[PDB]
Structure formats: structure tokens, C-alpha cells
Amino acid sequence: YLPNDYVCKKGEIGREMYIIQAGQVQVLGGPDGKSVLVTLKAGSVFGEISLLAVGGGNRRTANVVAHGFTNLFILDKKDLNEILVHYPESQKLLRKKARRMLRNNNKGRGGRLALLRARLKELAALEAAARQQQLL
Amino acid sequence: KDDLMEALTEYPDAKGMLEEKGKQILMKDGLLDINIANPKDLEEKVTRMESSVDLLQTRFARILAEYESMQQKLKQRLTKVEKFLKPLIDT
Amino acid sequence: KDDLMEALTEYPDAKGMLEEKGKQILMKDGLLDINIANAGPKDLEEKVTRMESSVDLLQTRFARILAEYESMQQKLKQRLTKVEKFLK
Amino acid sequence: LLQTRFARILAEYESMQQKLKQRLTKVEKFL
Amino acid sequence: EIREAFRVFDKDGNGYISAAELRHVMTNLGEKLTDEEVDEMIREADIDGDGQVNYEEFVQMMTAK
Numbered sequence: 001y002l003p004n005d006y007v008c009k010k011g012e013i014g015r016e017m018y019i020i021q022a023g024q025v026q027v028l029g030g031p032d033g034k035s036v037l038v039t040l041k042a043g044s045v046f047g048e049i050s051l052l053a054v055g056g057g058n059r060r061t062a063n064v065v066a067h068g069f070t071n072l073f074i075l076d077k078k079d080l081n082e083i084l085v086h087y088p089e090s091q092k093l094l095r096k097k098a099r100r101m102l103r104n105n106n107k108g109r110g111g112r113l114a115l116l117r118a119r120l121k122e123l124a125a126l127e128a129a130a131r132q133q134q135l136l
Numbered sequence: 137k138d139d140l141m142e143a144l145t146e147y148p149d150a151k152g153m154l155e156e157k158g159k160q161i162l163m164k165d166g167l168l169d170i171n172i173a174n175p176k177d178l179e180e181k182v183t184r185m186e187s188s189v190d191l192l193q194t195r196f197a198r199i200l201a202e203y204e205s206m207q208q209k210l211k212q213r214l215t216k217v218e219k220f221l222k223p224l225i226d227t
Numbered sequence: 228k229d230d231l232m233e234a235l236t237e238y239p240d241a242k243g244m245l246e247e248k249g250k251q252i253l254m255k256d257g258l259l260d261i262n263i264a265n266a267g268p269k270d271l272e273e274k275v276t277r278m279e280s281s282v283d284l285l286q287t288r289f290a291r292i293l294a295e296y297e298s299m300q301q302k303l304k305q306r307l308t309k310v311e312k313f314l315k
Numbered sequence: 316l317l318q319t320r321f322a323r324i325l326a327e328y329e330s331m332q333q334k335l336k337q338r339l340t341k342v343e344k345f346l
Numbered sequence: 347e348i349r350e351a352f353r354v355f356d357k358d359g360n361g362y363i364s365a366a367e368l369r370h371v372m373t374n375l376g377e378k379l380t381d382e383e384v385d386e387m388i389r390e391a392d393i394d395g396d397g398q399v400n401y402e403e404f405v406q407m408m409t410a411k
Contacts, residue, residue, distance in 0.1 A: 013237045056237045108288035112197025119198055119347055120376020123408070127377045130410055134390075179271030186278015192318055193285045195350060199325060200292055202354010205374025206332060207299060209367070210357065213339055214303070218310055220346060225313055286317060293324060300331055307338060329359020336358045336367065 001066040008047065008064035013056060015077040019045040023070030028063040039067065051080050052098040351375055352404050362398040364388075 001007055007025060008014055020042050029037035040046065050058040084091045144151040162168050235242045253260040355371025356363035363371060365388045369380055379387035391399045391407040399407070 015237060056239055108193065108197075108284060109200070112193070112200050112288075115194055115197040116201030116374070117376075119351070120201075120374075122376070123347075123351065124376040124378075126408070130407075133411070176271075179268065179275060182271065182275025182278055186274065186281055188318065189278060189282035189285050192321060193281070193288070196285070196289060196292070196321060198347065198350040199321075199353065202350065202371070202374035203296065203328065203357075205354060205372060206357030206367075206370035207303075208373050209370030210303070210332075210335060210339065212369070213343070213366070214306060214310070217339075217342060217346065218306075221310065221314055282317070289317065289321065289324075296324075296328065300335075303335065307335075310342075325353060326359075329353060329356075332357040333359045336364075340364075340366075 001070045001072060003066060003068045005066045005070075006063060007066055007070075007072065008060050008062075010060055010063045012060045014047055014050045014058050014060040015053070017045065017048045017051045017075045017077075019043075019073040019075075021071045021073060023072075024067045025070055025072075026065055026067055028065050033063065037062075049101070051075070051077050052094050052101075053077070348405055348408055351408070352401055355404075356401075361401050362396075363404070364398050368399075 001023075007018065020040060022042055024039055024041050025044075025046075026039040027037045029035055046064070084094070144154075159168065235245070250260055351371075351374075352363070353359065354374035355368065357367055357370045358364075365384050368384050368388065372378075372380060377387075388397065388399060389395075391403050393403060393406075394400075
């Protein structure tokens with residue numbers, strides 16, 4: 001990447017996972033943008049959380065810009081899926097990690113309970129109607 | 137064979153006509169192996185199995201809810217009995 | 228076409244937008260993309276696979292429920308025996 | 316097979332619940 | 347649904363549900379009848395007068411319009 005190149009743009013799919021082998025990159029944040037928040041150096045990875053996502057579900061959070069001539073190692077999500085095709089015991093672990101990360105943000109037994117509640121409400125409406133008919 | 141199949145992927149009736157006339161060619165001399173070798177029933181059974189599973193799950197949900205309610209009532213009764221016996225056990 | 232569907236794997240909403248725009252275009256000019264052709268063997272195969280998955284899930288749920296019920300019955304029997312022993 | 320197993324399990328659960336309810340009723344009547 | 351409701355409320359599985367067992371049918375079922383109200387509901391449903399609601403009595407109560 002050339003100097004002042006937007007490695008990651010804000011509001012982008014960000015499917016890949018970059019690692020740094022030579023150079024430095026900076027996360028352009030701040031109040032109105034164009035402000036450096038943190039710079040990562042050789043040996044730093046970023047964007048790995050997107051490798052376990054689904055089609056169009058990892059819109060990038062901020063902007064990432066290369067300070068100078070940087071040397072990144074991209075690993076696309078499609079390649080990860082192709083590799084995962086041949087490894088199910090790691091696929092289950094990766095999906096469990098994804099489910100944990102998605103569960104830690106929102107906050108057959110359930111369906112059976114819902115069906116029982118619907119049946120109970122239907123029976124209760126009829127019981128109230130029978131009580132009213134006995135009264136009336 | 138694979139090239140023929142993948143070229144026939146875009147042609148739905150060409151494969152049927154080809155197999156029909158291949159059956160005719162075989163019938164010209166040594167008709168296939170079994171002339172009575174001649175689908176929807178399999179799909180119907182596949183769907184009926186899913187329908188039966190759904191009905192069984194729907195029944196089992198209500199059964200489990202009723203069992204949970206009965207277990208809660210029995211546990212409450214047992215807890216009341218234990219609390220009543222508690223005065224004699226501790227004293 | 229394969230390239231187009233490969234470029235739409237990360238834009239599921241754009242896929243629906245494209246299909247809707249194409250459908251309105253066909254309705255404006257063409258045979259109105261007649262909707263009486265079908266509504267939903269591929270469909271039968273998908274339904275069979277979904278039914279098999281639902282049956283497997285129901286069997287697993289039934290096994291779990293049976294194990295839980297057996298554990299609860301054993302615990303209740305143990306509690307009743309302990310209460311009887313304490314009373315006696 | 317699942318339907319048959321469910322029916323058998325329901326019958327067994329009914330019998331076990333009957334035994335437990337009889338025992339609990341006897342205990343309550345005694346006390 | 348009637349058979350499942352009777353089985354859930356009638357935890358005894360003997361074909362008869364007692365007034366106390368109705369409490370176990372409270373959470374499982376969707377009706378409100380306990381204590382004096384439970385006894386009154388049992389008397390109304392128990393036409394025979396044995397103090398317990400049978401399968402036929404439960405069916406009649408559920409289908410009574």
C-alpha cells in the first residue's frame with residue numbers, strides 16, 4: 001500500500017483480514033475524523049472478526065490509513081470458507097465463537113413453551129366465555 | 137460424460153429427448169435389461185415424514201408444558217410438606 | 228452471470244433490489260413475467276431435507292426431554308425417600 | 316417410531332405421576 | 347389438544363384429576379381455578395360429585411358452549 005492509502009474505509013464490507021509485516025498503519029478516528037487514535041506496527045493483525053461473518057454483515061467501523069509504504073498480508077473470507085469446507089471440527093468452533101460474539105451484544109424448548117402458551121390462551125378465552133355464559 | 141451432462145445442464149428437454157431415443161436405439165436390439173424398469177411418491181413420503189415430525193413436536197411441546205406445570209405443583213406440595221416437617225426436625 | 232452472482236454474495240439487499248427492478252421492467256415491457264407459472268423436484272428435495280432436519284432436531288429434543296424427566300423423577304424419588312427417613 | 320416412543324413415554328410418565336401423586340396424597344393425609 | 351391438556355393437568359394419568367392436582371394444571375394449562383374457586387370449578391365440572399374431574403367431564407367442560 002502507498003502512503004495515505006485507505007486500507008479500510010468506514011462503512012465498507014471489510015471481509016478480509018490483514019496482517020502487518022513491514023510498515024505501520026493508523027486508525028483515523030477522532031471527533032470529526034482525520035485524527036489518529038492508534039497506530040499498529042509490524043506483527044499486528046486487524047479485521048479478523050470479519051472472517052467469521054456472513055454476506056454483507058460486517059460494515060467497517062472506522063477508517064484505517066497506511067502511514068507510508070506498507071506491506072500487508074490479506075486473507076479473504078472466501079478463501080477461509082473454501083478452507084473451512086474441508087475442516088468441520090474447526091468450523092464448529094469458529095461458528096461457536098461467532099455465536100458467542102453475536103450473543104454478547106444483544107443483551108426446541110422455547111417453541112414448545114410458545115405453543116403451550118398459545119394453547120393455554122385459546123383455552124382461557126373459552127373458559128372466560130363459558131363463565132360469562134353461565135353468568136349470562 | 138461429464139462434458140455432455142454439463143452442456144445439457146442449460147438444456148432441460150434435450151436430455152430427455154436424448155435418453156428417450158437412446159431407449160429406442162436399445163429397443164431396436166436388446167431392449168435395455170428390464171423392459172419394466174419404468175419419483176413423486178418419494179417426495180410425498182419425504183414431506184409426510186416432515187409433517188409427522190412437526191405434529192409430534194407440536195404435541196410434545198404441550199405435553200412438556202403440562203409436565204412442567206405438574207412437576208412445579210408437585211414440588212410445591214413436597215416443599216410445603218418438608219417445611220411442615222421442619223419444625224419437628226429442628227426442634 | 229456467475230460473476231454477477233459472485234459480486235452479489237456480500238450485498239443481499241442489492242440482490243433483492245436488482246430482482247425487483249428487473250421484475251418491474253419485465254412487467255412494463257414483455258409478458259409481464261407471468262406469476263401463474265409456479266409459487267414455490269428441487270422444491271420437493273428442499274422440503275424433504277428440511278423435514279429430515281426437523282425430525283432429527285425433534286428426536287434430539289425428545290431425547291433431552293426424556294433424560295431431564297428421568298433425572299427429575301430420580302431427584303423427586305430421592306427427596307421423598309429422604310423426607311420419609313427424616314420423619315421415621 | 317418417534318410417535319410410538321412418545322406414546323410409550325407419555326404412558327410411563329402418567330404411571331409414574333400417578334404413583335407419586337398417590338404417595339404425596341397419602342403423606343398429606345397422614346400429616 | 348384436549349388429550350394433551352388432560353394429561354398435563356391430570357399428572358396422575360389415571361383418568362381423573364383432583365382439586366389439588368388442578369394446581370399442577372394451573373401453569374401447564376391456561377385456566378384460573380384454585381383454592382375455593384378451584385373447588386367450585388371442580389364441583390361445576392364434576393357432575394357425578396366424586397370430587398375429581400374425569401376425562402369425559404374434562405372434555406365436556408372444554409367443549410361446553
